[PDB]
Design a protein around this ligand. Structure first.
Ligand SMILES: COc1cccc(-c2cc(F)ccc2[C@H]2Cc3nc(N)nc(C)c3C(=O)N2)n1
Length: 212
């Protein structure tokens, strides 16, 4: 499998470093942000399906799914949205403008929670995670895995190790030891009900209970 390496733009590498290092208190906002991206990605596939309902056939169910993996200290956020082609992942760039604007607003004293308003709320995941894999499948393209440690370099490899998505995106968040509360059914239920009431799509939570 060929791991293509790429370097992050200097503004993107500095944004990633700011968030991963910050002390922000309301770190739970990351979930609103990722859910909001997943909901938007679903809106995008649903729009195409208004024209062409064959676009939905790669994964007919439209959903956001939250999958804690206590064994691996991993929280996965999966959507069956539009997904991202390999070219998308290697060049993901409205980010450039929103990264600069958001950085200016932070100087003026904006709170970290305003990140979504500048369109770069994906990077809020580094509040609770030190490393991240992003697995994506766009309809007319193959399934790839993007990877970043918040440094200045990310990889994009063909996906030969993860479950097939059918269509969409799954973020594998490698949580920090301080933020392992977000693997908890009850803690995750709190954050979702608080900040994502108005989501057109089912937010499914996967829970592994032992049969007694
Ligand atoms: C989701 O995985 C990745 C990987 C690198 C960069 C981005 C990203 C970055 C932004 F700054 C702003 C927006 C994005 C993503 C956010 C996103 N999330 C999800 N769940 N699905 C899609 C299609 C996108 C999308 O279209 N663009 N997302």
């Amino acid at each position: 499998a060929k791991v293509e390496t790429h370097e992050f733009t200097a503004e993107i590498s500095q944004l990633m470093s700011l968030i991963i290092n910050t002390v922000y208190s309301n770190k739970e906002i990351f979930l609103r942000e990722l859910i909001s991206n997943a909901s938007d990605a679903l809106d995008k596939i649903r729009y195409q399906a208004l024209s062409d309902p064959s676009q939905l056939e790669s994964e007919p169910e439209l959903f956001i799914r939250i999958i804690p993996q206590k064994d691996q200290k991993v929280l996965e956020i999966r959507d069956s949205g539009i997904g991202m082609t390999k070219a998308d992942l290697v060049n993901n760039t409205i980010a450039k403008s929103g990264t600069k604007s958001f950085m200016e607003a932070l100087s003026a004293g904006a709170d970290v929670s305003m990140i979504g308003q500048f369109g770069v709320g994906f990077y809020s995941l580094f509040l609770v995670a030190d490393h991240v894999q992003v697995i994506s499948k766009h309809n007319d393209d193959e399934q790839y895995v993007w990877e970043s440690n918040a440094g200045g370099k990310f990889t994009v490899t063909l996906d030969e190790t993860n479950e097939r998505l059918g269509r969409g995106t799954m973020l594998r968040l490698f949580l920090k030891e301080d933020q392992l509360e977000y693997l908890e059914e009850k803690r995750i239920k709190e954050v979702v009900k608080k900040h994502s009431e108005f989501v057109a799509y089912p937010i499914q939570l996967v829970v592994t209970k032992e049969v007694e």
